[PDB]
Design an enzyme around this catalytic site. Sequence first.
Site, PDB file in Angstrom:
ATOM      1  N   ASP A 108      -4.374   0.928  -5.694  1.00  0.00           N
ATOM      2  CA  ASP A 108      -2.947   0.840  -5.412  1.00  0.00           C
ATOM      3  C   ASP A 108      -2.324  -0.511  -5.797  1.00  0.00           C
ATOM      4  OD1 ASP A 108      -4.283  -0.423  -3.313  1.00  0.00           O
ATOM      5  OD2 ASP A 108      -3.095   0.526  -1.753  1.00  0.00           O
ATOM      6  N   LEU A 117      20.837   3.248 -14.322  1.00  0.00           N
ATOM      7  CA  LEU A 117      21.379   4.218 -15.260  1.00  0.00           C
ATOM      8  C   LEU A 117      22.727   3.765 -15.785  1.00  0.00           C
ATOM      9  CD1 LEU A 117      20.703   7.433 -13.149  1.00  0.00           C
ATOM     10  CD2 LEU A 117      19.244   6.301 -14.806  1.00  0.00           C
ATOM     11  N   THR A 153       0.770  -1.229   0.000  1.00  0.00           N
ATOM     12  CA  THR A 153       0.000   0.000   0.000  1.00  0.00           C
ATOM     13  C   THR A 153       0.811   1.293   0.000  1.00  0.00           C
ATOM     14  OG1 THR A 153      -1.759  -1.129   1.144  1.00  0.00           O
ATOM     15  CG2 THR A 153      -1.796   1.273   1.143  1.00  0.00           C
ATOM     16  N   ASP A 213      21.855   1.465 -10.265  1.00  0.00           N
ATOM     17  CA  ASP A 213      20.979   2.636 -10.180  1.00  0.00           C
ATOM     18  C   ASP A 213      19.982   2.745 -11.338  1.00  0.00           C
ATOM     19  OD1 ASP A 213      22.788   3.590 -12.118  1.00  0.00           O
ATOM     20  OD2 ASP A 213      23.240   5.452 -11.066  1.00  0.00           O
TER      21      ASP A 213
HETATM   22  C1  LIG Z   1      13.657   8.120 -11.399  1.00  0.00           C
HETATM   23  O1  LIG Z   1      13.569   9.536 -11.332  1.00  0.00           O
HETATM   24  C2  LIG Z   1      14.409  10.100 -10.334  1.00  0.00           C
HETATM   25  C3  LIG Z   1      14.144  11.605 -10.240  1.00  0.00           C
HETATM   26  O2  LIG Z   1      14.589  12.215 -11.441  1.00  0.00           O
HETATM   27  C4  LIG Z   1      15.884   9.837 -10.616  1.00  0.00           C
HETATM   28  O3  LIG Z   1      16.606  10.143  -9.444  1.00  0.00           O
HETATM   29  C5  LIG Z   1      17.543  11.221  -9.575  1.00  0.00           C
HETATM   30  O4  LIG Z   1      18.757  10.751 -10.125  1.00  0.00           O
HETATM   31  C6  LIG Z   1      19.894  11.595 -10.103  1.00  0.00           C
HETATM   32  C7  LIG Z   1      21.111  10.721 -10.412  1.00  0.00           C
HETATM   33  O5  LIG Z   1      21.149   9.593  -9.550  1.00  0.00           O
HETATM   34  C8  LIG Z   1      20.122  12.300  -8.766  1.00  0.00           C
HETATM   35  O6  LIG Z   1      21.023  13.372  -8.989  1.00  0.00           O
HETATM   36  C9  LIG Z   1      21.902  13.554  -7.855  1.00  0.00           C
HETATM   37  O7  LIG Z   1      21.418  14.559  -6.990  1.00  0.00           O
HETATM   38  C10 LIG Z   1      22.172  14.630  -5.799  1.00  0.00           C
HETATM   39  C11 LIG Z   1      21.438  15.505  -4.779  1.00  0.00           C
HETATM   40  O8  LIG Z   1      20.052  15.204  -4.765  1.00  0.00           O
HETATM   41  C12 LIG Z   1      19.465  15.586  -3.497  1.00  0.00           C
HETATM   42  O9  LIG Z   1      18.562  16.672  -3.630  1.00  0.00           O
HETATM   43  C13 LIG Z   1      17.448  16.355  -4.450  1.00  0.00           C
HETATM   44  C14 LIG Z   1      16.657  17.618  -4.837  1.00  0.00           C
HETATM   45  O10 LIG Z   1      16.148  18.367  -3.742  1.00  0.00           O
HETATM   46  C15 LIG Z   1      14.717  18.569  -3.888  1.00  0.00           C
HETATM   47  O11 LIG Z   1      14.121  19.373  -2.870  1.00  0.00           O
HETATM   48  C16 LIG Z   1      14.267  20.781  -2.991  1.00  0.00           C
HETATM   49  C17 LIG Z   1      13.515  21.485  -1.867  1.00  0.00           C
HETATM   50  O12 LIG Z   1      14.023  21.080  -0.615  1.00  0.00           O
HETATM   51  C18 LIG Z   1      13.714  21.254  -4.330  1.00  0.00           C
HETATM   52  O13 LIG Z   1      13.796  22.660  -4.440  1.00  0.00           O
HETATM   53  C19 LIG Z   1      14.488  20.569  -5.446  1.00  0.00           C
HETATM   54  O14 LIG Z   1      13.983  20.994  -6.691  1.00  0.00           O
HETATM   55  C20 LIG Z   1      14.330  19.058  -5.294  1.00  0.00           C
HETATM   56  O15 LIG Z   1      13.000  18.681  -5.583  1.00  0.00           O
HETATM   57  C21 LIG Z   1      16.608  15.260  -3.780  1.00  0.00           C
HETATM   58  O16 LIG Z   1      15.515  14.918  -4.607  1.00  0.00           O
HETATM   59  C22 LIG Z   1      17.458  14.014  -3.508  1.00  0.00           C
HETATM   60  O17 LIG Z   1      16.696  13.059  -2.769  1.00  0.00           O
HETATM   61  C23 LIG Z   1      17.345  11.764  -2.645  1.00  0.00           C
HETATM   62  O18 LIG Z   1      18.057  11.617  -1.435  1.00  0.00           O
HETATM   63  C24 LIG Z   1      17.261  11.916  -0.299  1.00  0.00           C
HETATM   64  C25 LIG Z   1      18.145  11.857   0.941  1.00  0.00           C
HETATM   65  O19 LIG Z   1      19.074  12.921   0.907  1.00  0.00           O
HETATM   66  C26 LIG Z   1      16.070  10.956  -0.187  1.00  0.00           C
HETATM   67  O20 LIG Z   1      15.162  11.409   0.798  1.00  0.00           O
HETATM   68  C27 LIG Z   1      15.323  10.834  -1.512  1.00  0.00           C
HETATM   69  O21 LIG Z   1      14.403   9.761  -1.425  1.00  0.00           O
HETATM   70  C28 LIG Z   1      16.323  10.623  -2.648  1.00  0.00           C
HETATM   71  O22 LIG Z   1      16.988   9.382  -2.459  1.00  0.00           O
HETATM   72  C29 LIG Z   1      17.163   8.664  -3.707  1.00  0.00           C
HETATM   73  O23 LIG Z   1      18.210   9.181  -4.511  1.00  0.00           O
HETATM   74  C30 LIG Z   1      19.472   9.157  -3.859  1.00  0.00           C
HETATM   75  C31 LIG Z   1      20.513   9.910  -4.687  1.00  0.00           C
HETATM   76  O24 LIG Z   1      20.309  11.304  -4.555  1.00  0.00           O
HETATM   77  C32 LIG Z   1      19.890   7.712  -3.599  1.00  0.00           C
HETATM   78  O25 LIG Z   1      21.104   7.694  -2.879  1.00  0.00           O
HETATM   79  C33 LIG Z   1      18.812   6.978  -2.806  1.00  0.00           C
HETATM   80  O26 LIG Z   1      19.121   5.602  -2.789  1.00  0.00           O
HETATM   81  C34 LIG Z   1      17.434   7.179  -3.431  1.00  0.00           C
HETATM   82  O27 LIG Z   1      17.362   6.426  -4.622  1.00  0.00           O
HETATM   83  C35 LIG Z   1      18.756  14.417  -2.794  1.00  0.00           C
HETATM   84  O28 LIG Z   1      18.471  14.784  -1.458  1.00  0.00           O
HETATM   85  C36 LIG Z   1      23.568  15.149  -6.149  1.00  0.00           C
HETATM   86  O29 LIG Z   1      24.343  15.247  -4.975  1.00  0.00           O
HETATM   87  C37 LIG Z   1      24.256  14.223  -7.159  1.00  0.00           C
HETATM   88  O30 LIG Z   1      25.478  14.789  -7.632  1.00  0.00           O
HETATM   89  C38 LIG Z   1      26.582  13.843  -7.580  1.00  0.00           C
HETATM   90  O31 LIG Z   1      26.800  13.179  -8.815  1.00  0.00           O
HETATM   91  C39 LIG Z   1      27.192  14.061  -9.852  1.00  0.00           C
HETATM   92  C40 LIG Z   1      27.166  13.354 -11.205  1.00  0.00           C
HETATM   93  O32 LIG Z   1      27.298  14.306 -12.239  1.00  0.00           O
HETATM   94  C41 LIG Z   1      28.572  14.628  -9.536  1.00  0.00           C
HETATM   95  O33 LIG Z   1      29.014  15.475 -10.575  1.00  0.00           O
HETATM   96  C42 LIG Z   1      28.498  15.398  -8.222  1.00  0.00           C
HETATM   97  O34 LIG Z   1      29.791  15.837  -7.857  1.00  0.00           O
HETATM   98  C43 LIG Z   1      27.896  14.513  -7.128  1.00  0.00           C
HETATM   99  O35 LIG Z   1      28.849  13.552  -6.692  1.00  0.00           O
HETATM  100  C44 LIG Z   1      29.305  13.879  -5.357  1.00  0.00           C
HETATM  101  O36 LIG Z   1      28.792  12.996  -4.382  1.00  0.00           O
HETATM  102  C45 LIG Z   1      29.120  11.647  -4.652  1.00  0.00           C
HETATM  103  C46 LIG Z   1      28.407  10.762  -3.632  1.00  0.00           C
HETATM  104  O37 LIG Z   1      28.467  11.356  -2.353  1.00  0.00           O
HETATM  105  C47 LIG Z   1      30.638  11.445  -4.610  1.00  0.00           C
HETATM  106  O38 LIG Z   1      30.959  10.139  -5.042  1.00  0.00           O
HETATM  107  C48 LIG Z   1      31.375  12.450  -5.499  1.00  0.00           C
HETATM  108  O39 LIG Z   1      32.771  12.363  -5.249  1.00  0.00           O
HETATM  109  C49 LIG Z   1      30.835  13.866  -5.265  1.00  0.00           C
HETATM  110  O40 LIG Z   1      31.239  14.353  -4.000  1.00  0.00           O
HETATM  111  C50 LIG Z   1      23.313  13.903  -8.328  1.00  0.00           C
HETATM  112  O41 LIG Z   1      23.217  15.016  -9.189  1.00  0.00           O
HETATM  113  C51 LIG Z   1      18.834  12.805  -8.112  1.00  0.00           C
HETATM  114  O42 LIG Z   1      19.036  13.136  -6.754  1.00  0.00           O
HETATM  115  C52 LIG Z   1      17.746  11.743  -8.156  1.00  0.00           C
HETATM  116  N1  LIG Z   1      16.507  12.266  -7.600  1.00  0.00           N
HETATM  117  C53 LIG Z   1      15.681  11.540  -6.844  1.00  0.00           C
HETATM  118  C54 LIG Z   1      14.379  12.188  -6.464  1.00  0.00           C
HETATM  119  O43 LIG Z   1      15.922  10.393  -6.468  1.00  0.00           O
HETATM  120  C55 LIG Z   1      16.125   8.361 -10.932  1.00  0.00           C
HETATM  121  O44 LIG Z   1      17.430   8.204 -11.481  1.00  0.00           O
HETATM  122  C56 LIG Z   1      15.070   7.798 -11.894  1.00  0.00           C
HETATM  123  N2  LIG Z   1      15.257   6.362 -12.073  1.00  0.00           N
HETATM  124  C57 LIG Z   1      15.542   5.842 -13.273  1.00  0.00           C
HETATM  125  C58 LIG Z   1      15.904   4.387 -13.327  1.00  0.00           C
HETATM  126  O45 LIG Z   1      15.530   6.495 -14.309  1.00  0.00           O
HETATM  127 CA   LIG Z   2      -3.164  -1.104  -0.300  1.00  0.00          CA
HETATM  128 CA   LIG Z   3      24.697   2.725 -13.172  1.00  0.00          CA
HETATM  129 ZN   LIG Z   4      -3.586  -4.944   2.158  1.00  0.00          ZN
END
Ligand SMILES: *[C@@H]1O[C@H](CO)[C@@H](O[C@@H]2O[C@H](CO)[C@@H](O[C@@H]3O[C@H](CO[C@H]4O[C@H](CO[C@H]5O[C@H](CO)[C@@H](O)[C@H](O)[C@@H]5O)[C@@H](O)[C@H](O[C@H]5O[C@H](CO)[C@@H](O)[C@H](O)[C@@H]5O[C@H]5O[C@H](CO)[C@@H](O)[C@H](O)[C@@H]5O)[C@@H]4O)[C@@H](O)[C@H](O[C@H]4O[C@H](CO)[C@@H](O)[C@H](O)[C@@H]4O[C@H]4O[C@H](CO)[C@@H](O)[C@H](O)[C@@H]4O)[C@@H]3O)[C@H](O)[C@H]2NC(C)=O)[C@H](O)[C@H]1NC(C)=O
Ligand SMILES: [Ca+2]
Ligand SMILES: [Ca+2]
Ligand SMILES: [Zn+2]
EC number: 3.1.4.39
Length: 806
Positions: free
Chosen positions: A308, A689, A159, A687
């Site tokens: 759902d 991707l 759900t 991931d």
């Molecule tokens: C399905 O669709 C979704 C959505 O499009 C796809 O998911 C996206 O995929 C992207 C690539 O994986 C990813 O890009 C990340 O973003 C990182 C930061 O993201 C955080 O912030 C997000 C936005 O904030 C929101 O809220 C504000 C208001 O407060 C608004 O104004 C904004 O407009 C936004 O709406 C946020 O959504 C995101 O949430 C995730 O994490 C939260 C906890 O912090 C969780 O609560 C939430 O559920 C999300 O968790 C999921 O995603 C995370 C990954 O983010 C994952 O770990 C979880 O398992 C779960 O799956 C964040 O809070 C950003 O830091 C990343 O940048 C790194 O990589 C780039 C690559 O170019 C580097 O250049 C850069 O340097 C950096 O690397 C650095 O860090 C590395 C690791 O620490 C390190 O190795 C390196 O050395 C560097 O230091 C990257 O851009 C999106 O975040 C993600 N969005 C979501 C919603 O998940 C998904 O791919 C699709 N699926 C498929 C199969 O297509």
């Molecule tokens: Ca249900």
């Molecule tokens: Ca991958």
């Molecule tokens: Zn049920």
Amino acid sequence: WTATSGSCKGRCFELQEVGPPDCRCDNLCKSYSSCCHDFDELCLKTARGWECTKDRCGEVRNEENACHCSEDCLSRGDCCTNYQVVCKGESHWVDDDCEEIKVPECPAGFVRPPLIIFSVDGFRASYMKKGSKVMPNIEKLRSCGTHAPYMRPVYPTKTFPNLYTLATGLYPESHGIVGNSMYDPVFDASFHLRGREKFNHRWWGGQPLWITATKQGVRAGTFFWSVSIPHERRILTILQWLSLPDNERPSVYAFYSEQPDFSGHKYGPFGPEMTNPLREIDKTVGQLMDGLKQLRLHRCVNVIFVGDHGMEDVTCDRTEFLSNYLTNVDDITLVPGTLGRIRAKSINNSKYDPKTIIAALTCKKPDQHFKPYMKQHLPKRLHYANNRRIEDIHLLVDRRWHVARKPLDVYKKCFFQGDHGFDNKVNSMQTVFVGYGPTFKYRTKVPPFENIELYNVMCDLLGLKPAPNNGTHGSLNHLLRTNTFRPTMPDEVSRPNYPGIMYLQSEFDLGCTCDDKVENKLEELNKRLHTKGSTKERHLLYGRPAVLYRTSYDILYHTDFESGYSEIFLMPLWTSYTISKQAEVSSIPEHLTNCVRPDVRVSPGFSQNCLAYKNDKQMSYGFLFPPYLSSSPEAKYDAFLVTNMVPMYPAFKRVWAYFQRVLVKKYASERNGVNVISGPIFDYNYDGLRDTEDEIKQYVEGSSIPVPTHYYSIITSCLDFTQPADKCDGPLSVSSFILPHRPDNDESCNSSEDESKWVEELMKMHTARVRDIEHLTGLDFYRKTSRSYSEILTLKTYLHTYESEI
Ligand SMILES: *[C@@H]1O[C@H](CO)[C@@H](O[C@@H]2O[C@H](CO)[C@@H](O[C@@H]3O[C@H](CO[C@H]4O[C@H](CO[C@H]5O[C@H](CO)[C@@H](O)[C@H](O)[C@@H]5O)[C@@H](O)[C@H](O[C@H]5O[C@H](CO)[C@@H](O)[C@H](O)[C@@H]5O[C@H]5O[C@H](CO)[C@@H](O)[C@H](O)[C@@H]5O)[C@@H]4O)[C@@H](O)[C@H](O[C@H]4O[C@H](CO)[C@@H](O)[C@H](O)[C@@H]4O[C@H]4O[C@H](CO)[C@@H](O)[C@H](O)[C@@H]4O)[C@@H]3O)[C@H](O)[C@H]2NC(C)=O)[C@H](O)[C@H]1NC(C)=O
Ligand SMILES: [Ca+2]
Ligand SMILES: [Ca+2]
Ligand SMILES: [Zn+2]
Ligand SMILES: NS(=O)(=O)c1ccc(C(=O)N2C[C@H]3CN(C(=O)OCc4cc(Cl)cc(Cl)c4)C[C@H]3C2)cc1
Ligand SMILES: [Cl-]
Ligand SMILES: [Cl-]
Ligand SMILES: [Cl-]
């Protein structure tokens, strides 16, 4: 703490949440134990029930009543829903003929058609037909509006993951609600059904529709309802909200029903007891439509009727116990039931070993009703791995079954006949979709689609820009009369090179050999043509795939196939070929068994080498275009080019060889020709991707040849199979797969048998959408067809499920 001494006078079902310790009067105050002292008295009136009667018509207004039948009630917006029927001689909405809603017909001051989402828990897809006799209001919505025969939920089919997917457009691995029960190792916190941790905002990721709306200046009703609030009152509350002044009135609302899920768990999906819950839900739908009709909104509001997940027959006696497999059952924690999630009981236990757990759970009993996986090996279509809250060890449970740790968990924790949670391609898990209103189409049936697509549509219905999500925006345009989203194709990022002959054979030192040194003006000019693309129109039917990232690659043309060869990954990103219904299968000639040939269009430095495979004791190789399907003995030599070779474990070669030698021909025979695009996938961080070059964890020993995690194929033909694949005038038909590239066939318990007994079964389990392959490769397919782009987007989201008819 909550200062409940405040009052709900004039605040009943207020839309803004008031901060602690001030007492609340919103639809969630009951679940937070925070309602003002007089919330029940003022906001949950029940006196005289929910229906007007003849004697109440024109009554003096008595504010104590649950609803009103006085003359002023329409002005107050608080009539009983059957008021105009009982008192003013009107008809129930369900008794009215259905009439097309060509344009919105909305009262003055309405800036847009409101959206009302009517969500029903556990409403299995087949209820729409099987229960149609007792659900006249729902049947009218279905037949008069736009409906799918079913809608596919997300995995797990529970759900909370599904409701939140509906709200966000995200897979659970991305939005974070990966189960009804969860442990987050970073928070060191557990999320439970019963508790107050589950209301901590840190669990809920992405951006739900009500937030998307609010940020863009569109007001939203509060989506969640406390269980104790009766359905009749939820409906009355929505109708009351709809009577608010223009500047205060929300444009989007949600109703939720705990039924039929609640009864389905007790009685099974089709228990005799299930009729009543279906009737009652229909009655509620009737109350809403009657209420909308009274407010002159029944041809203004868009209504979505959506579930759902479904419900399967599951009883206590169909439980597998981990205690019958594992010696160390007390060393593990199991999330049990219709899926299994396993992790160590203690992080200080250095004797816990996932490898030994998986082995002890693998093909141990003949009729075994679950299968263990490391999460990265789960079918990619499930998109269930990229979240720390998903345990490394997963159990996929067979439909109708449960898994538990020990027998005492089942009788000391039969009490149930139904459950859900299984693989989201399972027929019993499918749920429902109906859209009705000015923005939906009239009397229109649409193909089944996935619930991740709905968030985009709801955003369209409301004029909102969707937050980034996992839908493919435009793929559901065929549901809508207007408000369609007209996407443009992604721009290609890397343009290919088109190499000619640039290297002599002796420049290569690859350790490869081939018995090909046996050999005109007729066919020497002819083969020159083939190398320049003279057959490309036949084998590349929908244009070259676009490469959507920065890279270096070559288009290579051949008589029987065309490829995009990556100089970075040393292998094709894609290989495209067409097999007609008349095509014949041949063997690989004895003298060519180990033949590999340098490609004189591609530098030695950008080629694989045979010595690496000779030295890698674990790794062999295969070919993307199958030598078995060569058009002629001479053309067959092209199939042995080093640029058509890919690394394959011997165990995988069993699978691949059967696919290429047997199944492709079978599909061409059945579908009147097929076009096949095949290639590698690299997803080492699971991931979903495409991996960059620096994320690759395994290479062929001693080389820079990367090992794919998966192999894909996209198999396209004409929807109208009376036309051959290569001469198709209309819509297309597709099936695809993403096969795990594994060094054993432990996933297939019958793999010791002939491939005809197990390979196709494996492939079906790993069926995929073209879109999934797009994410995993950074490629964009179907660039050049005669079809509308939205139709192509629908095609790319299609999943061939191999389930029987609903
Ligand atoms: C399905 O669709 C979704 C959505 O499009 C796809 O998911 C996206 O995929 C992207 C690539 O994986 C990813 O890009 C990340 O973003 C990182 C930061 O993201 C955080 O912030 C997000 C936005 O904030 C929101 O809220 C504000 C208001 O407060 C608004 O104004 C904004 O407009 C936004 O709406 C946020 O959504 C995101 O949430 C995730 O994490 C939260 C906890 O912090 C969780 O609560 C939430 O559920 C999300 O968790 C999921 O995603 C995370 C990954 O983010 C994952 O770990 C979880 O398992 C779960 O799956 C964040 O809070 C950003 O830091 C990343 O940048 C790194 O990589 C780039 C690559 O170019 C580097 O250049 C850069 O340097 C950096 O690397 C650095 O860090 C590395 C690791 O620490 C390190 O190795 C390196 O050395 C560097 O230091 C990257 O851009 C999106 O975040 C993600 N969005 C979501 C919603 O998940 C998904 O791919 C699709 N699926 C498929 C199969 O297509
Ligand atoms: Ca249900
Ligand atoms: Ca991958
Ligand atoms: Zn049920
Ligand atoms: N699957 S089960 O174990 O049988 C099981 C059965 C019943 C429950 C249960 O009573 N809940 C009651 C809670 C109140 N909820 C609700 O109002 O949501 C409206 C909604 C609609 C949409 Cl479109 C998106 C979203 Cl985000 C939310 C749903 C929760 C869940 C929980 C679990
Ligand atoms: Cl769960
Ligand atoms: Cl094997
Ligand atoms: Cl790369």
